[PDB]
Amino acid sequence: IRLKAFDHRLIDQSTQEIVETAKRTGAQVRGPIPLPTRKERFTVLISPHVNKDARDQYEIRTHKRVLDIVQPTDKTVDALMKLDLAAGVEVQISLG
Amino acid sequence: ATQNYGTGRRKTATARVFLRPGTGKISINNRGLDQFFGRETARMVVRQPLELTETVEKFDIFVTVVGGGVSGQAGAIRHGITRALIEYDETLRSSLRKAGYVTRDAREVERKKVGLRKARKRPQYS
Amino acid sequence: QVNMRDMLKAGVHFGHQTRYWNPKMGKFIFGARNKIHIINLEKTLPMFNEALTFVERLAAGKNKILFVGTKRSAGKIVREEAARCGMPYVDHRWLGGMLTNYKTIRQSIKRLRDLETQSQDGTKKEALMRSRDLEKLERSLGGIKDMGGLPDALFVIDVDHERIAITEANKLGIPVIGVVDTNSSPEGVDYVIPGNDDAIRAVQLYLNSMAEAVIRGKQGAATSADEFVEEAPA
Amino acid sequence: QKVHPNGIRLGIVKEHTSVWYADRKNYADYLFADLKVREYLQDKLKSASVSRIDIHRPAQTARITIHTARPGIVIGKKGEDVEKLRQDLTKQMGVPVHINIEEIRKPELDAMLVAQSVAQQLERRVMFRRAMKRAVQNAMRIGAKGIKIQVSGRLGGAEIARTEWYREGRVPLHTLRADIDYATYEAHTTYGVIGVKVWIFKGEV
RNA sequence: GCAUGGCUGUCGUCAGCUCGUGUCGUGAGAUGUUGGGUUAAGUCCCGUAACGAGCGCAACCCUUGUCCUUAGUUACCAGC
């Protein structure tokens, strides 16, 4: 299982929404593993007509997060996907 | 047992240092110590905390170091072995706090800032 | 009290010097013995008894009497023979603008009514950051717990030291019970006491008369608190 | 000069107005939808004052929560505007569209709702200060702890660019812990262009 | 761009800039905000016709440096 979102106050708060709501149904799912983080810097110029040394630089992040089942016997999380997706979490399934 | 685990980081390096009783076995990344560090003064700097605590002949030393620069890995071992020597007791604690070996060197590189060219150098005006 | 040996033994007669001097006071002087001015002994006690007459006249009339004159040397008798339910007092320097800027002081007593109770809780240095300010507010606003109205009796123990309160009194029209000396001027004060402020005995024997005359005023007010409702002895 | 009071606190105080993840091949094909939605909706809802238009993207369609302080004007006789726009938001945004409407109880404590009224008053030829001394005290009988309102522009004069500045209460701006609203709505008079800035300060933490 | 909004440079990341009520002055003003000590700092302490409040400075945020807990694939190899 792999998860992609934009802020750690969603994506690392929806794993407990999956770990609790799958281990309850009997199957063993281990602890989630972090991945390296995408970081993209964007330095943009700020003045309309030119004054070059005034700048401003941003950064867009992307948090990744990987789950790991042990015994696949539950289609419970397959129906509870619209619940576990909330606003900006994308879940590609790797049911190991 | 008597295996002792020692880590140490200096200038974005990282060295696994294992320490156990032996007879002068100094091996790093499956290489000899004189062979690994080619023609530098830091061949003796890795021995400087060892010969200070008069244990140069009494241990096996197994070192695995990753990353960093050439003479930055040699500093990682020197900080790394001092943490491995103080797993025993605090008898050699005062022999190394006074020696200035235990403190990790915090001096890391500084980022380029806009307007400037280097970290602090700026172009010439008139 | 009215006794003469209270006046003789306390050290009332002596003045400051002969060059520290004011001829607006010089009507009430007796001599210049050994280059130190001797105040008059015979015009003091008729003035002094009639001052306590109007203290007692106010004290049974449900009002306030204010004790001032904060010197750290000899003002502790003002700290001591006060602090009861009918008389406020002061402990530190008189604040510039109190009777005239009383609207501000109503806002600054709001902090005083909390930081005693706020020290129930007591981070670590953050408790000391607010319990430090409780000492200064106790040093100045501590003697006044009354709020509302203005004090109808200002008892000034030293006129030369505090011209601030006399000016702010006469802008509002409240009686000022001053104790002048040789060098200080007898203007601005209402009921004069031509006395002295150079001994611990004289500053005490002026004030045992004042706090006793308000107890009998409160004893007179307790005599008259039944007169307010019942009319048979009223 | 005074970096924008949302762009320094996205994080510790406020959050985005639109949350959706997108791949690097479709990221710039959802932005151009969501930026000509907001130019569309405010030009239709010029009355029935609108403060915030949030957009979520659930699985494969949409969700929109339009906020008005007067929902009865928009939902008029059971959604005669709601289903009429929901037909026609799909024509700009090919997914099926949800439309949801909440209330903005205490309308005098959000900066967009306040600053739209300033443009209304200053285009009725109301005095530049009698409009605004009353538009701050009304927003101080209930609610906020500090308000700044700057009114800059032509201000009726010949060649005059003065700035009215009136403040009440406490407004910090170098504290990231605080909670500040901000809005700039403009005004087109019969001469000149007047811009209005609002800095409603709600409670801190 | 000297009809203006918006957005940026500059003095200068320099330590200042103002108000309420009060008193002094015929008035424009002034006092608070000066004095002694001290601070990167109008930062603090003691003083004091002023008592307070705001903007600022500080802290709140990010990152780097130490350790602890939760986590082990695609990362990791001390033991096997």
XYZ file of C-alpha atoms (C1' of nucleotides) in Angstrom:
741
model
C 0.000 0.000 0.000
C 1.376 3.463 -0.767
C 0.025 6.911 0.041
C 0.681 10.364 -1.415
C -0.566 13.683 -0.048
C 0.652 17.200 0.646
C 0.651 17.657 4.421
C 1.588 15.434 7.342
C -1.533 16.458 9.252
C -3.505 14.320 6.830
C -1.427 11.455 5.516
C 0.166 10.414 8.808
C -3.258 10.833 10.427
C -5.005 8.532 7.944
C -2.700 5.557 8.496
C -4.237 5.054 11.936
C -7.553 5.267 10.073
C -6.366 2.189 8.135
C -4.152 0.324 10.632
C -6.874 0.261 13.289
C -9.641 -0.385 10.740
C -7.914 -3.411 9.244
C -6.259 -5.073 12.246
C -9.711 -5.055 13.880
C -10.924 -7.437 11.158
C -8.352 -10.087 12.052
C -5.662 -9.614 9.423
C -2.180 -8.591 10.514
C -0.852 -5.304 9.127
C 2.581 -4.139 10.248
C 3.739 -0.630 11.093
C 3.885 1.941 8.302
C 7.261 2.852 6.834
C 8.231 6.402 5.823
C 9.882 7.198 2.524
C 12.061 10.089 1.332
C 10.183 13.298 0.647
C 9.820 15.205 -2.602
C 11.049 18.795 -2.223
C 10.798 21.316 -5.073
C 12.128 24.860 -4.742
C 10.632 27.668 -6.860
C 12.530 30.961 -6.833
C 10.350 33.623 -8.441
C 11.006 37.276 -9.115
C 8.754 39.646 -7.231
C 8.847 43.089 -8.860
C 6.634 43.942 -11.866
C 9.166 46.165 -13.577
C 12.641 45.123 -12.882
C 14.673 45.165 -9.711
C 16.454 41.849 -9.777
C 17.878 41.301 -6.296
C 14.425 41.274 -4.636
C 13.283 37.662 -4.811
C 11.068 35.140 -3.066
C 11.419 31.369 -2.983
C 8.822 28.727 -2.164
C 8.772 24.972 -1.677
C 6.172 22.297 -2.422
C 6.354 19.034 -0.481
C 4.996 15.535 -1.065
C 4.817 13.065 1.808
C 4.976 9.336 1.111
C 3.901 6.512 3.379
C 3.864 2.723 2.887
C 1.742 0.105 4.659
C 2.352 -3.639 4.779
C -0.209 -6.404 5.326
C 0.719 -9.944 6.341
C -2.319 -12.094 5.550
C -4.774 -10.857 2.894
C -8.260 -12.031 3.838
C -10.196 -8.748 4.240
C -12.116 -6.881 1.566
C -13.255 -4.573 4.389
C -10.769 -1.827 3.480
C -11.820 -2.176 -0.173
C -15.245 -0.795 0.716
C -13.755 1.600 3.292
C -11.672 3.515 0.755
C -14.045 6.462 0.330
C -13.857 6.765 4.119
C -10.057 6.613 4.238
C -9.739 9.127 1.399
C -10.618 12.484 2.932
C -9.382 15.464 0.970
C -6.007 15.081 -0.697
C -4.767 11.559 -0.050
C -4.157 9.235 -2.987
C -3.837 5.515 -2.279
C -2.286 3.099 -4.745
C -2.872 -0.447 -3.539
C -0.056 -2.971 -2.995
C -1.698 -5.741 -0.973
C 1.385 -7.738 -0.061
C 29.397 -9.709 25.167
C 32.508 -7.611 24.575
C 31.543 -6.233 21.159
C 31.203 -2.463 21.436
C 29.326 -0.303 18.969
C 30.604 3.146 18.116
C 29.256 5.803 15.761
C 30.570 9.218 14.838
C 29.699 11.917 12.330
C 31.757 14.832 11.041
C 31.253 16.764 7.769
C 28.377 14.561 6.483
C 30.210 11.310 7.152
C 29.093 8.303 9.191
C 31.298 5.517 10.552
C 30.224 2.250 12.112
C 33.047 1.363 14.496
C 33.019 -1.997 16.244
C 35.411 -2.642 19.110
C 36.236 -5.988 20.723
C 39.341 -7.512 22.369
C 42.040 -8.515 19.940
C 45.627 -7.920 18.867
C 46.036 -4.764 16.785
C 43.537 -5.815 14.121
C 42.795 -2.506 12.410
C 40.645 -3.096 9.340
C 38.385 -0.619 7.554
C 35.919 -1.564 4.769
C 37.971 -4.744 4.226
C 41.115 -2.653 3.759
C 44.238 -2.046 5.766
C 44.621 1.298 7.472
C 47.781 2.300 5.612
C 46.187 1.245 2.327
C 42.861 3.019 2.790
C 44.001 6.555 3.643
C 46.491 7.259 0.892
C 49.396 9.511 1.925
C 48.047 11.781 4.619
C 48.737 12.789 8.198
C 45.330 11.468 9.295
C 46.737 7.920 9.247
C 47.962 8.771 12.756
C 44.993 10.962 13.734
C 42.761 7.878 13.921
C 45.222 6.502 16.503
C 45.375 9.681 18.607
C 42.455 8.884 20.983
C 43.626 5.279 21.006
C 47.225 5.917 22.044
C 46.088 8.542 24.546
C 44.079 5.950 26.487
C 46.992 3.399 26.265
C 44.939 0.687 24.528
C 46.665 0.665 21.139
C 47.566 -3.040 21.281
C 44.628 -4.523 23.181
C 41.668 -4.461 20.784
C 40.335 -5.571 17.464
C 38.956 -2.648 15.459
C 36.405 -3.094 12.664
C 35.359 0.107 10.881
C 32.743 0.715 8.190
C 32.408 4.344 7.070
C 30.078 5.826 4.437
C 29.674 9.191 2.735
C 31.614 12.330 3.474
C 34.915 13.491 2.093
C 38.399 12.026 2.239
C 39.641 13.704 5.405
C 36.089 13.983 6.711
C 35.782 10.242 7.123
C 39.012 10.204 9.135
C 37.447 12.652 11.563
C 34.323 10.511 11.770
C 36.393 7.564 12.973
C 38.167 9.704 15.570
C 34.873 10.920 16.981
C 33.429 7.454 16.460
C 35.963 5.477 18.448
C 35.787 7.864 21.429
C 32.139 6.988 21.894
C 33.066 3.310 21.709
C 35.806 3.663 24.319
C 33.471 5.240 26.869
C 31.032 2.355 26.927
C 33.338 0.815 29.546
C 33.314 3.355 32.357
C 33.996 7.009 33.080
C 37.634 6.506 34.042
C 38.705 7.734 30.605
C 35.869 10.296 30.539
C 38.030 12.997 32.119
C 40.956 11.902 29.945
C 38.913 12.807 26.849
C 36.716 15.728 27.935
C 39.972 17.501 28.758
C 41.446 16.228 25.484
C 38.692 17.799 23.391
C 37.691 14.609 21.568
C 34.134 13.844 22.646
C 32.347 16.935 21.279
C 30.990 16.573 17.757
C 32.221 19.374 15.493
C 29.075 21.275 14.513
C 30.680 23.352 11.750
C 28.682 22.546 8.608
C 28.574 24.256 5.203
C 26.423 27.327 4.623
C 23.911 27.952 1.889
C 24.026 30.394 -1.004
C 21.912 33.505 -0.405
C 20.316 35.669 -3.086
C 22.153 38.781 -4.197
C 25.404 37.220 -3.017
C 27.498 34.807 -5.062
C 29.137 32.629 -2.416
C 27.769 32.158 1.103
C 29.035 35.672 1.947
C 30.941 37.040 -1.069
C 29.079 39.665 -3.113
C 29.903 41.303 -6.456
C 31.903 44.481 -6.814
C 30.239 47.857 -7.258
C 31.702 51.296 -7.881
C -2.661 64.831 73.943
C -3.559 68.270 75.311
C -0.898 67.823 78.027
C 1.978 70.283 78.016
C 4.730 67.792 78.853
C 3.783 65.869 75.732
C 4.781 69.033 73.872
C 7.904 69.668 75.961
C 9.402 66.169 75.875
C 8.697 65.210 72.256
C 10.835 67.953 70.738
C 8.199 70.216 69.231
C 9.763 73.595 69.951
C 12.870 73.381 67.750
C 13.014 74.410 64.099
C 15.269 73.599 61.158
C 17.904 76.427 61.224
C 18.048 80.185 60.881
C 18.850 80.481 57.172
C 16.313 77.882 56.069
C 13.538 80.315 56.669
C 10.170 81.673 55.580
C 8.643 84.948 56.831
C 5.131 83.851 55.847
C 5.433 81.458 58.796
C 7.257 83.937 61.065
C 4.120 85.072 62.874
C 4.118 81.728 64.699
C 7.702 81.872 65.971
C 9.078 82.540 69.449
C 12.839 82.989 69.234
C 16.235 82.312 67.677
C 18.103 80.635 70.527
C 21.590 79.317 69.589
C 21.027 79.940 65.836
C 18.114 77.435 65.762
C 14.590 78.829 65.631
C 12.229 78.141 68.531
C 8.571 77.818 67.571
C 5.804 79.333 69.674
C 4.448 77.182 72.495
C 1.190 78.970 73.373
C -0.622 79.347 70.037
C -0.100 75.702 69.073
C -2.554 73.837 71.320
C -5.627 76.045 70.640
C -4.983 75.389 66.949
C -4.161 71.746 67.657
C -7.326 71.028 69.656
C -9.600 72.626 67.057
C -8.037 70.464 64.341
C -9.185 67.313 66.152
C -12.610 68.936 66.569
C -13.228 68.817 62.813
C -11.583 65.405 62.477
C -14.187 64.035 64.900
C -16.826 66.126 63.142
C -16.094 64.295 59.892
C -15.306 60.864 61.355
C -18.882 60.284 62.560
C -20.220 61.316 59.153
C -19.443 58.242 56.985
C -16.472 59.414 54.931
C -12.740 58.813 54.502
C -9.554 60.212 56.046
C -6.279 59.958 54.137
C -2.848 59.669 55.780
C 0.176 60.705 53.696
C 3.766 61.842 54.162
C 5.889 58.888 53.094
C 9.430 59.243 54.314
C 11.254 55.946 54.762
C 12.910 57.309 57.921
C 10.045 58.460 60.151
C 6.888 57.550 58.230
C 6.508 54.079 59.758
C 4.221 55.457 62.454
C 1.908 56.380 59.567
C 2.326 52.781 58.434
C 1.513 51.577 61.950
C -1.329 53.647 63.443
C -3.450 53.288 60.317
C -4.662 50.466 58.018
C -8.131 50.033 59.461
C -11.519 50.155 57.767
C -12.008 53.932 57.825
C -8.650 55.357 56.761
C -6.594 54.693 53.618
C -2.892 55.487 53.598
C 0.160 55.510 51.320
C 3.561 53.814 51.513
C 5.607 55.037 48.520
C 6.037 58.338 46.638
C 2.818 60.228 45.945
C 1.881 59.595 42.325
C 1.698 62.628 40.081
C -2.006 62.973 39.495
C -4.141 60.854 41.787
C -7.143 62.903 42.859
C -7.315 64.551 39.427
C -6.453 61.455 37.358
C -8.550 59.060 39.427
C -10.146 57.552 36.307
C -6.780 56.031 35.389
C -6.175 54.687 38.896
C -9.562 52.920 38.784
C -8.171 51.012 35.805
C -4.863 50.241 37.522
C -6.511 48.801 40.648
C -8.014 46.145 38.361
C -4.571 44.530 38.268
C -4.379 44.800 42.060
C -7.647 42.876 42.517
C -6.293 39.901 40.568
C -2.585 39.309 41.185
C -3.104 38.361 44.826
C -5.579 35.662 43.782
C -3.614 34.927 40.582
C -0.688 33.637 42.691
C -2.842 30.596 43.541
C -1.330 28.835 40.529
C 2.248 30.101 40.436
C 6.259 28.075 33.754
C 8.974 28.490 36.388
C 10.398 31.973 35.800
C 7.048 33.056 34.298
C 5.573 32.907 37.803
C 8.388 35.221 38.920
C 7.699 37.530 35.957
C 4.301 38.438 37.448
C 4.967 37.964 41.163
C 7.672 40.624 40.844
C 5.080 43.239 39.835
C 2.987 42.403 42.903
C 5.682 43.998 45.084
C 5.570 47.398 43.362
C 1.762 47.473 43.317
C 1.804 46.562 47.006
C 4.370 49.314 47.562
C 2.170 52.053 46.078
C -1.423 50.921 45.518
C -1.399 48.563 48.507
C -2.491 51.106 51.112
C -5.555 52.061 49.066
C -8.071 49.250 48.859
C -10.975 51.706 48.750
C -12.569 52.504 45.407
C -15.233 55.101 44.731
C -15.525 58.723 45.728
C -12.708 60.961 46.877
C -11.252 61.207 50.400
C -12.848 64.030 52.377
C -9.866 64.512 54.701
C -6.255 64.813 53.582
C -3.970 64.693 56.623
C -0.556 65.895 55.470
C 2.198 65.341 58.008
C 4.819 67.411 56.130
C 3.878 70.319 53.884
C 7.357 71.139 52.534
C 7.822 67.600 51.202
C 4.568 67.181 49.229
C 3.238 70.153 47.288
C 1.767 67.643 44.834
C -1.227 66.515 46.881
C -2.033 70.023 48.147
C -2.331 71.334 44.579
C -4.497 68.393 43.510
C -6.668 68.793 46.614
C -7.498 72.471 46.076
C -8.425 71.777 42.453
C -11.282 69.668 43.847
C -12.095 71.405 47.136
C -11.352 68.912 49.903
C -10.088 69.839 53.399
C -6.344 69.559 53.991
C -5.106 68.914 57.526
C -1.508 70.033 57.213
C 1.348 70.040 59.703
C 3.610 72.949 58.783
C 7.127 73.653 60.064
C 9.203 76.818 60.306
C 10.539 76.693 56.748
C 7.353 75.507 55.030
C 4.686 77.931 53.919
C 1.240 78.032 55.574
C -0.598 78.392 52.257
C -2.705 75.673 50.673
C -3.259 73.931 54.008
C -6.653 74.460 55.639
C -6.359 73.554 59.337
C -2.784 74.354 60.296
C -0.725 72.581 62.951
C 2.375 74.714 63.620
C 4.566 71.842 64.720
C 7.784 70.023 63.965
C 8.908 67.010 61.933
C 12.392 66.401 63.320
C 11.882 63.599 65.865
C 10.259 60.192 66.153
C 8.429 61.349 69.289
C 6.868 64.426 67.675
C 5.738 62.525 64.575
C 4.173 59.915 66.873
C 2.481 62.305 69.313
C 0.832 64.131 66.421
C -0.631 60.877 65.144
C -1.820 59.235 68.356
C -4.263 62.141 68.517
C -5.501 61.548 64.961
C -6.159 57.808 64.926
C -7.787 58.001 68.359
C -10.137 60.812 67.315
C -11.450 58.658 64.459
C -11.982 55.626 66.739
C -14.187 57.841 68.902
C -15.595 59.062 65.609
C -16.312 55.433 64.756
C -17.526 54.975 68.328
C -19.625 58.055 67.647
C -20.638 56.563 64.299
C -21.588 53.331 66.072
C -23.514 55.534 68.502
C -25.199 57.184 65.501
C -25.703 54.118 63.277
C -28.871 53.437 65.284
C -29.874 57.092 64.789
C -30.026 56.454 61.023
C -32.951 54.007 61.346
C -34.435 54.700 64.796
C -35.505 58.197 65.834
C -35.829 57.895 69.625
C -32.269 58.978 70.595
C -31.733 60.748 67.247
C 6.958 45.990 2.775
C 4.562 43.912 4.875
C 4.587 40.451 3.301
C 1.062 39.080 2.824
C -0.549 37.960 6.108
C -1.761 34.650 4.691
C 1.442 33.615 2.949
C 3.468 33.642 6.130
C 0.855 31.597 8.024
C -0.198 28.638 5.896
C 0.400 26.168 8.598
C 0.299 27.454 12.172
C -2.898 29.498 11.753
C -4.853 28.893 8.549
C -5.041 26.313 5.762
C -5.538 26.334 1.998
C -8.824 27.116 0.318
C -8.551 24.043 -1.916
C -7.187 20.568 -1.163
C -6.569 17.966 -3.888
C -3.587 15.852 -4.880
C -2.606 15.738 -8.535
C 0.095 14.067 -10.584
C 2.689 16.047 -12.506
C 0.776 15.392 -15.744
C -2.571 16.785 -14.549
C -1.518 19.379 -11.961
C -1.769 22.278 -14.396
C -5.065 21.009 -15.772
C -6.903 21.297 -12.460
C -5.564 24.754 -11.621
C -6.983 26.357 -14.744
C -10.359 24.915 -13.853
C -10.265 26.160 -10.250
C -9.119 29.676 -11.166
C -11.854 30.482 -13.680
C -14.455 29.053 -11.327
C -13.744 31.781 -8.778
C -13.792 34.494 -11.425
C -17.130 33.113 -12.578
C -18.880 32.760 -9.220
C -18.073 36.192 -7.822
C -19.269 37.887 -10.990
C -22.599 36.093 -10.623
C -22.887 36.480 -6.840
C -22.158 40.193 -6.725
C -24.959 40.524 -4.208
C -25.599 37.857 -1.526
C -22.116 38.436 -0.158
C -19.526 35.682 -0.570
C -16.396 35.307 1.546
C -14.846 31.912 0.782
C -15.236 29.348 -1.996
C -13.626 26.050 -1.036
C -13.044 23.198 -3.471
C -12.321 19.605 -2.583
C -11.661 16.870 -5.106
C -12.813 13.483 -3.877
C -12.578 10.462 -6.138
C -12.998 11.669 -9.711
C -15.591 14.403 -9.435
C -15.791 17.504 -7.213
C -17.145 19.309 -4.151
C -17.680 23.062 -3.630
C -18.771 24.865 -0.441
C -19.870 28.421 -1.266
C -20.136 30.555 1.871
C -22.722 33.328 2.081
C -24.027 35.302 5.026
C -27.451 35.389 3.315
C -28.163 31.887 1.986
C -31.830 32.594 1.253
C -30.960 34.822 -1.689
C -28.992 32.052 -3.383
C -31.252 29.178 -2.366
C -34.381 30.952 -3.545
C -37.607 28.910 -3.601
C -35.751 25.614 -3.072
C -32.706 25.842 -5.298
C -33.821 27.759 -8.378
C -30.222 29.005 -8.562
C -28.590 25.874 -7.125
C -29.618 23.399 -9.816
C -29.350 26.135 -12.442
C -25.666 26.680 -11.696
C -25.015 22.971 -11.150
C -26.015 22.389 -14.763
C -23.603 25.106 -15.825
C -20.604 24.636 -13.577
C -20.111 21.332 -15.379
C -19.802 23.242 -18.666
C -16.631 24.917 -17.381
C -15.473 22.002 -15.214
C -16.319 18.724 -16.949
C -16.744 16.658 -13.753
C -20.146 16.578 -11.998
C -20.294 19.411 -9.484
C -21.570 19.517 -5.920
C -22.717 22.833 -4.453
C -23.056 23.286 -0.692
C -24.010 26.456 1.190
C -23.346 27.384 4.829
C -23.996 30.518 6.880
C -21.586 33.255 7.952
C -23.297 34.219 11.231
C -21.621 37.365 12.598
C -21.084 38.817 9.090
C -19.194 41.781 10.593
C -16.172 39.667 11.541
C -14.919 38.466 8.143
C -12.836 40.808 6.077
C -14.270 40.167 2.610
C -17.818 40.785 3.806
C -16.803 44.043 5.474
C -14.725 45.408 2.612
C -17.454 44.820 0.040
C -19.661 47.199 2.013
C -16.958 49.865 1.900
C -16.998 49.881 -1.890
C -20.795 50.148 -1.777
C -20.755 53.149 0.547
C -17.948 54.971 -1.244
C -19.761 54.692 -4.577
C -23.007 56.106 -3.149
C -21.059 59.369 -2.595
C -20.871 58.887 1.165
C -18.177 60.772 3.092
C -14.884 58.890 3.219
C -14.760 58.870 7.028
C -18.389 58.840 8.164
C -18.657 55.567 6.275
C -15.686 54.112 8.135
C -15.937 55.420 11.689
C -19.256 53.567 11.753
C -17.918 50.478 9.975
C -15.394 49.796 12.751
C -17.428 50.486 15.888
C -20.164 48.240 14.473
C -17.500 45.562 14.112
C -16.400 46.222 17.694
C -19.742 45.992 19.502
C -19.543 42.245 18.797
C -16.385 40.235 18.399
C -12.917 41.288 17.380
C -10.012 42.518 19.471
C -8.430 44.785 16.870
C -9.282 46.292 13.479
C -7.194 48.273 11.022
C -8.744 49.736 7.892
C -6.646 51.564 5.325
C -8.453 53.548 2.631
C -6.128 54.765 -0.091
C -6.766 56.240 -3.483
C -8.049 59.396 -5.101
C -10.318 60.273 -2.113
C -12.267 62.869 -4.094
C -9.401 65.329 -4.508
C -7.738 66.875 -7.527
C -4.224 65.401 -7.378
C -4.413 63.752 -3.971
C -3.322 60.263 -2.937
C -3.910 60.384 0.794
C -4.348 57.360 3.051
C -6.900 57.103 5.837
C -5.621 54.832 8.536
C -8.067 54.426 11.448
C -7.352 51.780 14.094
C -8.990 50.410 17.218
C -7.664 47.874 19.676
C -4.707 45.542 19.234
C -3.392 44.126 15.963
C -0.067 42.262 15.916
C 1.554 41.288 12.648
C 4.953 39.797 13.529
C 3.423 37.030 15.659
C 2.872 33.849 13.684
C 0.817 32.409 16.538
C -2.012 34.909 15.998
C -5.037 34.655 13.685
C -5.539 37.480 11.179
C -7.963 37.934 8.294
C -7.157 39.969 5.209
C -9.008 41.196 2.130
C -8.527 43.787 -0.608
C -11.629 44.784 -2.529
C -11.532 47.803 -4.807
C -13.898 50.552 -5.918
C -14.524 52.341 -9.214
C -15.884 55.814 -8.568
C -16.709 58.399 -11.218
C -13.026 59.368 -11.067
C -10.128 57.281 -9.797
C -9.777 53.806 -8.324
C -9.938 53.358 -4.548
C -8.426 50.267 -2.929
C -9.429 49.194 0.578
C -7.427 46.953 2.929
C -8.833 45.247 6.049
C -6.960 43.543 8.919
C -9.606 42.044 11.254
C -7.784 40.464 14.198
C -9.679 37.664 15.895
C -8.401 35.898 18.997
C -4.878 34.557 19.191
C -3.450 30.996 19.431
C 3.776 56.567 -12.811
C 2.770 64.551 -11.367
C -4.954 61.765 -12.289
C -4.466 56.858 -9.411
C -5.065 51.474 -7.323
C -1.786 47.079 -7.157
C 3.160 45.398 -6.545
C 8.705 46.183 -5.395
C 13.496 49.163 -4.242
C 15.521 52.627 -0.568
C 17.231 54.607 4.172
C 17.608 50.023 7.699
C 16.727 44.632 10.433
C 18.359 50.653 11.831
C 15.915 51.141 17.499
C 12.967 53.831 17.429
C 7.809 56.121 16.349
C 2.955 57.735 18.539
C -1.783 57.910 21.608
C -5.374 58.228 26.214
C -6.087 60.816 30.673
C -3.484 64.469 33.939
C -0.591 68.861 35.110
C 2.677 73.146 33.452
C 2.529 77.456 29.148
C -1.394 83.704 26.803
C 0.004 80.432 22.693
C 3.021 77.061 18.660
C 4.807 73.487 22.427
C 6.363 70.478 26.274
C 6.154 66.367 29.902
C 5.685 60.772 29.787
C 9.942 58.908 26.061
C 14.457 62.769 30.744
C 18.488 60.946 35.532
C 22.160 56.750 37.544
C 23.492 51.678 36.054
C 23.131 48.195 32.019
C 21.940 45.889 27.335
C 22.579 43.127 20.517
C 17.655 46.478 22.067
C 12.794 52.724 24.355
C 16.194 45.336 26.751
C 15.854 45.692 31.942
C 16.738 47.910 37.355
C 16.766 52.173 40.639
C 14.897 56.966 40.534
C 10.966 60.743 39.177
C 3.991 65.382 37.659
C 2.899 61.917 35.291
C -0.246 57.014 35.223
C -1.145 53.791 31.381
C -1.811 51.566 26.305
C -0.385 50.351 21.179
C 3.318 49.604 16.943
C 8.412 47.803 17.207
C 12.699 44.586 19.760
C 12.268 39.511 22.219
C 9.672 35.014 21.890
C 5.868 32.067 18.567
C 7.961 29.380 12.798
C 11.855 26.690 9.767
C 16.652 24.199 9.503
C 21.282 22.136 11.475
C 23.835 19.635 15.986
C 22.537 15.175 21.169
C 19.395 11.407 22.953
C 14.608 8.702 23.583
C 10.086 6.350 21.862
C 6.861 4.317 17.089
C 8.270 2.171 12.351
C 11.682 -2.143 8.633
C 10.819 -2.266 1.950
C 12.876 -0.910 -2.761
C 16.674 0.857 2.667
C 20.044 -1.982 6.432
C 24.111 -6.378 7.391
C 26.186 -6.990 13.752
C 24.384 -12.512 14.884
C 23.004 -17.066 11.716
